[PDB]
């Protein structure tokens, strides 16, 4: 398949900013390159075809350029309705028609470190044999964040899952919840439970912990 | 306006089959090549299949692994995707999309895929799972700002809803997307930040509703 490398994966913008997104194809595709917009909860819509031609109804602030392997989508002066995810797609070779990985355009605000909270498992849950330990990273920006779990200073890998909220409509932040799952039997064999958070708003990682 | 409407999504067991439908309106369906494109939860767009207007050519992405069949009934303005050998990783929203077919401002003579896909349906959701319907267990996340919450664990299928104090508490609430556990059951958390000074005095109750299992739970969350 032709591989499409789309950059960046995440860009923050303010109303009025110019935005540039690039797409590079692994082999030449002439001008057979399209761009789509996908708003949260909606199907994609076609913005540009033939590298640079605007679909009817698309505002003039959108433009596309390039041929061969290197292509660009530019928004000249971003408006509120343009916060969305954008995708390139080559239409030179089938199968497979291939999409870039997407560019998520979110609302710019100042950096905000997370407030971090750790929650032990409840006694009620432990009665049925599993322990969930939860780490909350509240109201941070930007979205990139890393959580590392430690149990008696042993790094835990493979036994946690996390999810992240959508950007808050009022304060433009994100929040993240991570759950470490272990058996009650293992939980009761260890003392110190810790969540270590790395985030751009902190010049060193922050750890929250409890002793069982 | 010109539109496409998908249907047929739902829950199917691994190894099973499912037929999706896509009905077009207000255009001459037989003139256009048609596509299926899918999007797994939180992931990007993946093209999966193509059929020409006259049905004489079909293509499939390698990820189909030659398990699916694309077809159409132009007399009923309908495109179909017959899926077989389904696996958990086929869980996604499935979109049907029409070829633009030309690079002119208005397309009268329709070619192939070279100029993108100009009309998309709203999508239909397919979930592939062997799990059985099950209501959640609700556990406390016990608490000058304090955080508290509820862990809504081991339920199937989606969705669950969570409110706090019967809807009276909305400020500072974050209800997170569920995660799919290796057991095949979902788990989610809902949290709220509140003044620490309110902890001895204000009651905090999370109201959980899992309609698929008719399970409702009200959990009062207090300092341990």
Domain identity same for B79 and B168? no
Alpha-carbon span A80 to A82, nearest angstrom: 5
Query: Kindly report the CA angle at B89 between B87 and B90, in degrees rounded to 5?
Result: 70
Alpha-carbon span A130 to B137, nearest angstrom: 12
Neighbours of A151 (CB within 10 A): 20
H/E element, B62: none
CA B117 to each of CA A16, A97, B20, B30, B54: distance values in angstroms, whole numbers, following the listed order: 29, 11, 19, 16, 18
B 54-93 near A (Cβ less than 8 A): 59-62
Domain boundary among B79, B112, B130: B130
**What single-letter DSSP state applies at residue A112?**
B
Alpha-carbon span B203 to B131, nearest angstrom: 36
Alpha-carbon span A125 to B43, nearest angstrom: 32
CA-nearest residue of chain A to B64? A96
H/E element, B121: none
B 175-204 near A (Cβ less than 8 A): 176-179, 181, 187-189, 191, 193
Burial of A72 (0-12, 13-18, 19+ CB in 10 A): middle
Give the sign of the dihedral formed by CA B157, CA B158, CA B159, CA B160: positive
Domain identity same for B55 and B145? no
The CATH code of the domain that includes B138 is 2.60.40.10
Alpha-carbon span B41 to A191, nearest angstrom: 36
Of A32, A49, A102, the CB nearest to B44: A102
Domain boundary among B130, B145, B168: B130
Neighbours of B190 (CB within 10 A): 24
Domain boundary among B106, B130, B154: B130
Structure tokens, B80: 């179909």
- Contact at CB, B45 and A87, closer than 8 angstroms: yes
Minimal Cα–Cα distance from B139 to chain A, Å?
A: 7
- Contact at CB, A132 and B177, closer than 8 angstroms: no
Domain identity same for B14 and B63? yes
A 9-68 near B (Cβ less than 8 A): 32, 34, 36, 38, 42-46, 49-50, 53, 55-56
Q: B37-67 burial by CB neighbour count: b if 16+ within 10 A, else e?
A: bbbeeeeebbbbbbbbbeeeeebbbeebeee
Q: How many helices (H) and strands (E) does chain A have?
A: 2, 19
- Contact at CB, A175 and B176, closer than 8 angstroms: yes
The answer, for B7 touching chain A at a CB cutoff of 8 Å, is no
Domain identity same for B9 and B69? yes
Q: Are A95 and A106 in contact (CB under 8 A)?
A: no
HEC profile of chain B: CCEEEEECCCEECCCCCEEEEEEEECCCHHHCCEEEEEECCCCCEEEEEEECCCCCCEEECHHHCCCCEEEEEHHHCEEEEEECCCCHHHCEEEEEEEECCCCCCCCCCCCCHHHCEEEECCCEEEEECCCCCECCEEEEECCCEEEEEEEEEEEECCCCEEEEHHHCECCCEEECCCEECCCCCEEEEEEEEEEHHHCCCCCCEEEEEEHHHCEEEEEECCCC
Q: What residues have CB less than 8 Å from A70, skipping those under 6 apart? A: A22, A23, A24, A25
Neighbours of B22 (CB within 10 A): 25
Count of structural domains within chain B:
2
**What single-letter DSSP state applies at residue A63?**
E
Domain identity same for B109 and B183? no
Q: Are B145 and B169 in contact (CB under 8 A)?
A: no
Query: Kindly report the CA angle at A37 between A33 and A40, in degrees rounded to 5?
Result: 150
Residue at token pair 């990783």: B89
Domain range holding B150? 131-223
The tally of CA atoms less than 13 A away on the side-chain side of residue A133 is 29
Of B45, B59, B140, the CB nearest to A44: B45
Q: Are B129 and B88 in contact (CB under 8 A)?
A: yes
Q: Are B164 and B155 in contact (CB under 8 A)?
A: no
Closest by CA position to B73, among listed B119, B131, B22: B22
Neighbours of A212 (CB within 10 A): 15
CA-nearest residue of chain B to A35? B116
Domain identity same for B86 and B160? no
How big, in percent rounded to 5, are the helix, strand and coil portions of chain B? 10, 50, 40
The answer, for A178 touching chain B at a CB cutoff of 8 Å, is no
Domain identity same for B172 and B78? no
Domain identity same for B72 and B147? no
What does chain A come to in residues? 212
Structure tokens, B55: 């049905």
Contacts of A117 in chain B (CB under 8 A): 147
Closest by CA position to A49, among listed A35, A69, A37, A29: A35
**What single-letter DSSP state applies at residue B156?**
B
Q: A158-184 burial by CB neighbour count: b if 16+ within 10 A, else e?
A: eebebbbbebeeeebbbbbbbbbbbee
The answer, for B105 touching chain A at a CB cutoff of 8 Å, is yes
Domain identity same for B95 and B171? no
Of B103, B141, B176, the CB nearest to A53: B103
Preceding-residue numbers of gaps in chain A (C–N over 2.5 Å)? none
CA A81 to each of CA A57, A78, A88, A100: distance values in angstroms, whole numbers, following the listed order: 14, 8, 19, 22
H/E element, A185: helix A184-187
Contacts of A112 in chain B (CB under 8 A): none
CA-nearest residue of chain A to B171? A170
Q: Which domains does chain A have, with CATH numbers?
A: 1-108 (2.60.40.10), 109-212 (2.60.40.10)
Closest by CA position to A62, among listed A44, A54, A108, A99: A54
Domain identity same for B15 and B110? yes
Minimal Cα–Cα distance from A101 to chain B, Å?
A: 6
CA-nearest residue of chain A to B176? A165
Q: How many helices (H) and strands (E) does chain B have?
A: 0, 19
Q: What residues have CB less than 8 Å from B195, skipping those under 6 apart? A: B144, B145, B146
Specify which residues B127 forms β-bridges with: B11
How many contacts, defined by CB atoms under 8 Å, are there between A and B? 133
CA-nearest residue of chain A to B6? A43
Contacts of B62 in chain A (CB under 8 A): 1, 95-96
Specify which residues B174 forms β-bridges with: B191
Closest by CA position to A178, among listed A126, A210, A208, A136: A136
Domain identity same for B70 and B97? yes
Residue at token pair 């299992």: B213
Of B103, B145, B177, the CB nearest to A50: B103
Q: What residues have CB less than 8 Å from A198, skipping those under 6 apart? A: A145, A146, A148, A205
Minimal Cα–Cα distance from B125 to chain A, Å?
A: 12
Alpha-carbon span A187 to A192, nearest angstrom: 10
Neighbours of A115 (CB within 10 A): 17
Domain identity same for B183 and B91? no
Alpha-carbon span A142 to B82, nearest angstrom: 42
């Amino acid at each position: 398949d032709i591989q499409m490398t789309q950059s960046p994966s995440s860009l923050s913008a303010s109303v009025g900013d110019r935005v540039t997104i690039t797409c590079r194809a692994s082999q030449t595709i002439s001008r057979y390159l399209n761009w789509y917009q996908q708003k949260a909860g909606k199907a994609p819509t076609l913005l540009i075809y033939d590298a640079s031609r605007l679909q009817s109804g698309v505002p003039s602030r959108f433009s596309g350029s390039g041929s061969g392997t290197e292509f660009t989508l530019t928004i000249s002066s971003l408006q509120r309705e343009d916060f969305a995810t954008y995708y390139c797609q080559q239409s030179d070779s089938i199968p497979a028609l291939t999409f870039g990985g997407g560019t998520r355009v979110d609302i710019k605000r100042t950096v905000a470190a997370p407030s971090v909270f750790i929650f032990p498992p409840s006694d009620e849950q432990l009665k049925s044999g599993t322990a969930s330990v939860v780490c909350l990273l509240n109201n941070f920006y930007p979205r990139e964040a890393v959580v590392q779990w430690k149990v008696d200073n042993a790094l835990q890998s493979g036994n946690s899952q996390e999810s992240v909220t959508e950007q808050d409509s009022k304060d433009s932040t994100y929040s993240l919840s991570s759950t470490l799952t272990l058996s009650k039997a293992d939980y009761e064999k260890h003392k110190v439970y810790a969540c270590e958070v790395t985030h751009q708003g902190l010049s060193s990682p922050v750890t929250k912990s409890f002793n069982r | 306006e010109v539109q496409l409407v998908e249907s047929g999504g739902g829950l199917v067991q691994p190894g099973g089959s499912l037929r999706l439908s896509c009905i077009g309106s207000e255009f001459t369906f037989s003139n256009y090549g048609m596509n299926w494109v899918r999007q797994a939860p939180g992931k990007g767009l993946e093209w999966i299949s193509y059929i020409t207007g006259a049905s004489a050519t079909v293509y499939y992405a390698a990820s189909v692994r030659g398990r699916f069949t694309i077809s159409r009934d132009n007399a009923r303005n309908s495109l179909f995707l017959e899926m077989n050998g389904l696996r958990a990783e086929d869980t996604a929203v499935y979109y049907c999309a029409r070829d633009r077919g030309c690079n002119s401002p208005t397309c009268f003579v329709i070619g192939y895929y070279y100029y993108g896909m100009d009309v998309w349906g709203q999508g239909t959701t397919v979930t592939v799972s062997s799990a059985s319907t099950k209501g959640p267990s609700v556990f406390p996340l016990a608490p000058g700002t304090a955080a508290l919450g509820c862990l809504v664990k081991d339920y199937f299928p989606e969705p669950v809803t969570v409110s706090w104090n019967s809807g009276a508490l909305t400020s500072g609430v974050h209800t997170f997307p569920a995660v799919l556990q290796s057991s095949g059951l979902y788990s989610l958390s809902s949290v709220v930040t509140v003044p620490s000074s309110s902890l001895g005095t204000q009651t905090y109750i999370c109201n959980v509703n899992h309609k698929p299992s008719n399970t409702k739970v009200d959990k009062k969350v207090e300092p341990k």
